[PDB]
Amino acid sequence: SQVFGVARIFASFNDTFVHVTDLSGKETIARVTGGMKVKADRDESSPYAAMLAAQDVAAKCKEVGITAVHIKLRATGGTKTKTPGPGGQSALRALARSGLRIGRIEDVTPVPSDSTRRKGGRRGRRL
RNA sequence: AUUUUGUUGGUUUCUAGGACCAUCGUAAUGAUUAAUAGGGACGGUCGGGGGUAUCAGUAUUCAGUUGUCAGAGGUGAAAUU
Ligand SMILES: [Mg+2]
Ligand SMILES: [Mg+2]
Ligand SMILES: [Mg+2]
Ligand SMILES: [Mg+2]
Ligand SMILES: [Mg+2]
Numbered sequence A: 001s002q003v004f005g006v007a008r009i010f011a012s013f014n015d016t017f018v019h020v021t022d023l024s025g026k027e028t029i030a031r032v033t034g035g036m037k038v039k040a041d042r043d044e045s046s047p048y049a050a051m052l053a054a055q056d057v058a059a060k061c062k063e064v065g066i067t068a069v070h071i072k073l074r075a076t077g078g079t080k081t082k083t084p085g086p087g088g089q090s091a092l093r094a095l096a097r098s099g100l101r102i103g104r105i106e107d108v109t110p111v112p113s114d115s116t117r118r119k120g121g122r123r124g125r126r127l
Numbered sequence B: 001a002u003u004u005u006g007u008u009g010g011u012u013u014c015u016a017g018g019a020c021c022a023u024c025g026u027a028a029u030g031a032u033u034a035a036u037a038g039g040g041a042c043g044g045u046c047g048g049g050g051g052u053a054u055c056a057g058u059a060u061u062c063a064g065u066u067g068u069c070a071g072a073g074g075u076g077a078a079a080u081u
């Protein structure tokens, strides 16, 4: 039927990565980040920049033959936050509205079974 | 050692006295509770109680392979990087 890639979306609170690979993930097809669409650091992770980033990703996918993708959304994970950034929601909707077909969706945020010390110190970051 | 042998040393038998040792007979012969104190034993347990080994788990970082290409990182915004 369709030809599937894998859209590995890494949405932090400082940027948004839209990365489409093959099934194995060893072959990169298109990688457009929210920082390639704006010249201000403060909105590299904006929903607007993620939508533009996803459209460029979707456009590149079409000329190579990728007609559908599976979604593997992730946050920063590790010792840091597990909730996805604001750009992860926009890049997914933009991909679906660009004529690309959507397959399976999964959260693949790396989650420790209790692990390393987190930055900030005992008293946290004081603001 | 309490008396007397006319008498003082006496003298050791004698007398009597505790103090024990044996036998027999008397006797209802002789051991307070087990504290909703405690200690101990025992029986099924119950615990992320402790120690010594042992087996996971993903994560972090670093490295090896790869894949693409312009930014990545970080913040309230940036910059050092
Ligand atoms: Mg940023
Ligand atoms: Mg730029
Ligand atoms: Mg410090
Ligand atoms: Mg405060
Ligand atoms: Mg006389």
Ligand SMILES: [Mg+2]
Pocket: B034, B035
């Ligand atoms: Mg008792």
Ligand SMILES: [Mg+2]
Pocket: none
């Ligand atoms: Mg026992």
Ligand SMILES: [Mg+2]
Pocket: B058
């Ligand atoms: Mg896992």
Ligand SMILES: [Mg+2]
Pocket: none
């Ligand atoms: Mg530059």
Ligand SMILES: [Mg+2]
Pocket: none
């Ligand atoms: Mg520059």
Ligand SMILES: [Mg+2]
Pocket: A014, A015, A035, A041, A044, B072, B073
């Ligand atoms: Mg950045």
